[PDB]
Ligand binder design. Structure first.
Ligand SMILES: *[C@@H]1O[C@H](CO)[C@@H](O[C@@H]2O[C@H](CO)[C@@H](O[C@@H]3O[C@H](CO[C@H]4O[C@H](CO)[C@@H](O)[C@H](O)[C@@H]4O)[C@@H](O)[C@H](O[C@H]4O[C@H](CO)[C@@H](O)[C@H](O)[C@@H]4O)[C@@H]3O)[C@H](O)[C@H]2NC(C)=O)[C@H](O)[C@H]1NC(C)=O
Ligand SMILES: *[C@@H]1O[C@H](CO)[C@@H](O[C@@H]2O[C@H](CO)[C@@H](O)[C@H](O)[C@H]2NC(C)=O)[C@H](O)[C@H]1NC(C)=O
Lengths: 161, 57, 54
């Protein structure tokens, strides 16, 4: 019944790190290198820890989507983050989600032997969420406030308009 | 009740997808059989209904 | 243990996830601690996990 994108995190408040990182696997309509609009890639954490807290003071639940970077090797991990570490714990209400650093080759797809794996959660009204990250994290800079409906429909798969 | 098309399970849950597939097969058999014999029974009764009305005149 | 009773036995256990090396050292005096519990032919292994939670 309702669905709004909003900005949830001010990424400029994190220091000694780079934000809004991009890649040629996600071009704009032109071509080039871009990235997901709602997900902010943070690099060069350098082992340093970042802390963030948020409270959904809205009268609607909040949907947030994040990603965890699985690097290919120590060299690729060093180039992106400058440390053989980088682990994120994101807590929503009373669940804890911990994503320890994982380094492993995968087969190359879109010029990538590395992977970014995406996860999501729902922050209920007047509930909180927090992020503690030392690297390898793609932040949920934007999210969707939404209103659930009881009657569930699903997805219609068609090429028509 | 509100009809839904959300019947998708993940790649390693094919057994759950099969359970959903046979659940819909079960209702398909139930509704098809009941619908066929409903129409057959009522059609025979409807023709008898007209016969009774004619006989009653 | 062997269940020599004429009824199945329900057992419940727990595995401690410590916050840091200091908390692990205070509770157990070693940066280790791992449990393997085997029931019949299943094996359940719970390696040591150290991580803050909220
Ligand atoms: C999620 O999905 C469900 C299922 O589709 C929806 O629920 C249905 O909602 C509709 C409308 O809200 C319901 O239809 C209404 O039923 C009322 C009760 O009907 C009984 O009683 C009356 C006598 O009072 C009998 O005549 C009737 O046969 C039943 O025995 C009716 O009072 C309503 O009448 C309305 O329509 C008529 C014209 O059709 C008007 O003249 C009236 O003034 C009035 O406006 C209506 O028929 C239906 O029963 C619900 N079904 C179920 C299974 O829940 C949910 O609405 C839906 N959610 C959303 C958000 O869409
Ligand atoms: C969600 O976050 C808010 C803000 O951090 C928490 O409320 C604050 O708690 C402190 C005490 O620790 C108070 O001084 C503030 O006044 C509180 N702020 C508000 C707006 O009430 C709140 O407790 C958190 N929720 C949970 C479940 O931990």
């Amino acid at each position: 019944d309702h669905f709004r994108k909003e900005k949830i995190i001010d990424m400029t408040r994190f220091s000694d790190v780079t934000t809004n990182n991009v890649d040629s696997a996600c071009p704009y309509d032109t071509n080039g290198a871009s990235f997901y609009r709602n997900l902010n890639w943070v690099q060069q954490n350098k082992g340093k820890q970042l802390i963030f807290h948020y409270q959904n003071s809205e009268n609607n639940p909040l949907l947030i989507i994040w990603g965890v970077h699985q690097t290919s090797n120590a060299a690729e991990q060093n180039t992106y983050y400058g440390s053989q570490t980088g682990s994120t714990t994101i807590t929503i209400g009373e669940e804890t989600n911990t994503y320890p650093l994982v380094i492993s080759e995968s087969s190359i797809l879109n010029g990538h032997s590395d992977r970014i794996n995406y996860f999501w959660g729902v922050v209920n009204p007047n509930q909180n969420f927090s992020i503690v990250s030392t690297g390898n994290f793609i932040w949920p800079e934007y999210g969707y406030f939404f209103q659930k409906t009881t009657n569930i429909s699903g997805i219609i798969k068609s090429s028509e308009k | 009740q509100f009809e839904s098309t959300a019947k998708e399970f993940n790649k390693i849950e094919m057994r759950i997808k099969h359970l959903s597939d046979r659940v819909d097969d079960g209702f398909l058999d139930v509704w098809s059989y009941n619908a066929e014999l409903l129409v057959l029974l009522e059609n025979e009764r409807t023709l008898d209904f007209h016969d009774a009305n004619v006989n009653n005149l």
